[PDB]
Amino acid sequence: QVQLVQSGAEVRNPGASVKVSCKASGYTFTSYAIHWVRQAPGHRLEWVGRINTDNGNTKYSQKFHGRVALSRDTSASTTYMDLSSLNSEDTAVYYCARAFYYSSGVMFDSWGQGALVTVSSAPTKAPDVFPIISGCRHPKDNSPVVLACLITGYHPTSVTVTWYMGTQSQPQRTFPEIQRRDSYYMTSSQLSTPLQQWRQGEYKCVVQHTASKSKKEIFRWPESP
Amino acid sequence: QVQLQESGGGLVQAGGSLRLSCAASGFTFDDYAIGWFRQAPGKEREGVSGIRRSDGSTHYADSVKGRFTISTDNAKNTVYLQMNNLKPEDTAVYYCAAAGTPSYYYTEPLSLGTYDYWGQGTQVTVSS
Amino acid sequence: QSALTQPPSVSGAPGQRVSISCTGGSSNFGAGYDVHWYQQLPATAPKLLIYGNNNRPSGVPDRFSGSKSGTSASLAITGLQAEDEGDYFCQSFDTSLSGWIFGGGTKLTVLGQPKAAPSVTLFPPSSEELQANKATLVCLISDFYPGAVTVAWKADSSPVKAGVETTTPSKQSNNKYAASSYLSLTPEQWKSHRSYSCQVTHEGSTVEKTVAPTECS
Ligand code: NA
């Protein structure tokens, strides 16, 4: 079916530029126009610009003052948005959408998943991951064991956590990410099913942080202190 | 900063004539069609006539066919709307609009969804 | 006006009806440009819900209808479902700006959902964290509804406010709310006190969990 898939999230220093891609599939790419819309936190959707996938001509929102440029590669079935001179108000999810013509105004019948662009002066830093546990590693009082991983000191958001019992993925509980007093972020991921006993290394939390190109695994909860 | 400036409006007697002009400026591309829309008091904007600048092809609404003549002068970036045998029902605010996507103009030359650049409009009154 | 105005939020009971107004101006709705409606569920891309004032594309149930008077549109939803929760945007084109416009969006909350007590687990500082000269108490709060919770910390029996960071609750993919509270301590604070406690209040009930430095031997 008609599908728009965009590149991943990006983080940028203020005054830099970012190039977001949007690959189209499931239909004739050059037979439909592609628009770009952004969504800032606590803001409405804001139209960014249009580009004809055939002849490549563009039309931009005057609110951006020449800072946004749109391009397309018909061989790759992909449109690109380049937003230069980034500022803090440019932190937003950038969608691409297909223009379906309608005599009383075009519609956006297919939307891409969006790409988060974060504009920050704070450094990018990989997370520290700590194995945390409730009920002690080897309970003597029949208490259930709860495993979780404390994920702290990273920037920017976000991190992705998965749990594994061997190679089998395991259900988890997700929690919000909060910005610490030191402008860094912290969060937690809890293994959903309580435990009793397990061989050392049976369970693990895998914490991916694309911004820092780092993936950290924790597969050992040491003898209880 | 695309601009579309209408001119030539005013007040005429039934059966009279008027020539409207739309001065275009700020275009970073030149494959665009120019349309003329009119909005009578308490109504919507309806397509009167349009012209593709490169193709030179014109279209007209049935209510104005024969009486109205749209012509382009790409050297001056101006599109003219010659209006003859004006009727009181022709009274409206006339707008000139540009179509940035040529595929839309080939499908619907006189539909609002075809034009994504718009001028401020000029008033035309035909008395009796 | 050269923009579309929607109410910030609209709430309704399941099986009941709700209406979302989207008012514009002469330069968009009044010029003849129609309204399009988009539905954006939590953590997903917007989806075309209604186009051309009152038309539904393939996949949209009859429970969604729309009207437009040329200056004010309306998206009505009959028989509210829990899955209807999300943000609903209207959209048009403005001739005075020569650009496409979107409404501010309306958050649809479906009331009457089944209430759920929070599942609270309090984690002491990990040995690894203590070896980094840092100590964080982790109070994980999951699987509750509605989202309002209050978290309070106690060292022994006395309240603690310094070093506390409590997340705003938010719905997770399980359609339940989750939250967290972190008590940042020095290793000396953690070892000196007899115990620390996380107190979670939620809809007329309070749950308290307690950890101690020597509870594991
Ligand atoms: Na693995």
The amino acid sitting at A44 is R
A104 to chain B: nearest residue by CA?
Answer: B113
Q: For chain A, what's the residue count? A: 225
Contact C31 B45 (CB under 8 A): yes
Q: Which residues are paired to A149 by β-bridges?
A: A131, A189
User: Would strands B58-60 and C164-166 be described as parallel, antiparallel, or unpaired?
Assistant: unpaired
A167 CA distance to ligand 1 middle (Å):
5
Q: Resolution to 1 decimal, in Å?
A: 2.1
Q: Which residues are paired to A163 by β-bridges?
A: A170, A205
The tokens describing A171, both together, are 């259900």
Q: Which residues are paired to A82 by β-bridges?
A: A19, A69
CA B42 and chain centroid, separation: 19
Contact C46 A95 (CB under 8 A): yes
Contacts of C51 in chain A (CB under 8 A): 100, 102, 107, 109
Contact A103 B111 (CB under 8 A): yes
Euclidean distance between CA atoms A69 and A80, whole angstroms: 8
Element holding C197 (H helix, E strand): strand C196-201
Contact, A27 vs A38, CB < 8 A? no
The tokens describing B13, both together, are 């007697």
Sorted by where each starts, the structural domains of chain C and their CATH numbers stand as 2-112 (2.60.40.10), 113-214 (2.60.40.10)
Euclidean distance between CA atoms A124 and A98, whole angstroms: 33
Q: Where are the beta strands (DSSP E) in A40-196?
A: 45-51, 58-60, 68-73, 78-83, 92-100, 107-111, 115-119, 128-134, 146-154, 160-165, 168-170, 172-174, 178-179, 185-191
Contact A47 C178 (CB under 8 A): no
Sorted by where each starts, the structural domains of chain B and their CATH numbers stand as 3-127 (2.60.40.10)
Sorted by where each starts, the structural domains of chain A and their CATH numbers stand as 3-119 (2.60.40.10), 128-218 (2.60.40.10)
Q: Which residues are paired to A25 by β-bridges?
A: A3
The CA-atom distances, in angstroms, between A125 and each of A15, A36, A154, B66, C61 are 20, 30, 5, 71, 46
Contacts of C90 in chain A (CB under 8 A): none
Q: Cα angle at C125 between C123 and C130, to 5 degrees?
A: 170
Q: Would you give the DSSP letter of residue C42?
A: T
Element holding C130 (H helix, E strand): helix C127-131
Element holding C207 (H helix, E strand): strand C206-211
The tokens describing B12, both together, are 């005429």
Task: Report whether the peptide linkage leading into residue B88 is cis, meaning its omega lies within 30 degrees of zero.
Answer: no
The CA-atom distances, in angstroms, between C76 and each of C52, C66, C69 are 15, 6, 14
Residue among B49, B46, B9, B7 nearest B24 (CA) = B7
What DSSP string runs through A13-35? Answer: -TT--EEEEEEEESS-GGGSEEE
Contact, B122 vs B9, CB < 8 A? yes
Chains touching chain A through at least 3 C-beta pairs below 8 angstroms are B, C
The tokens describing B37, both together, are 């829309």
Euclidean distance between CA atoms C129 and A147, whole angstroms: 15
Query: Exposed, middle or buried: residue A124 (CB in 10 Å: 0-12, 13-18, 19+)?
Result: middle
Contacts of A60 in chain B (CB under 8 A): none
Q: Would you give the DSSP letter of residue B103?
A: H
Euclidean distance between CA atoms B62 and B78, whole angstroms: 24
Euclidean distance between CA atoms C147 and C169, whole angstroms: 6
Residue among A20, A213, A50, B128 nearest C100 (CA) = A50
Element holding C165 (H helix, E strand): strand C164-166
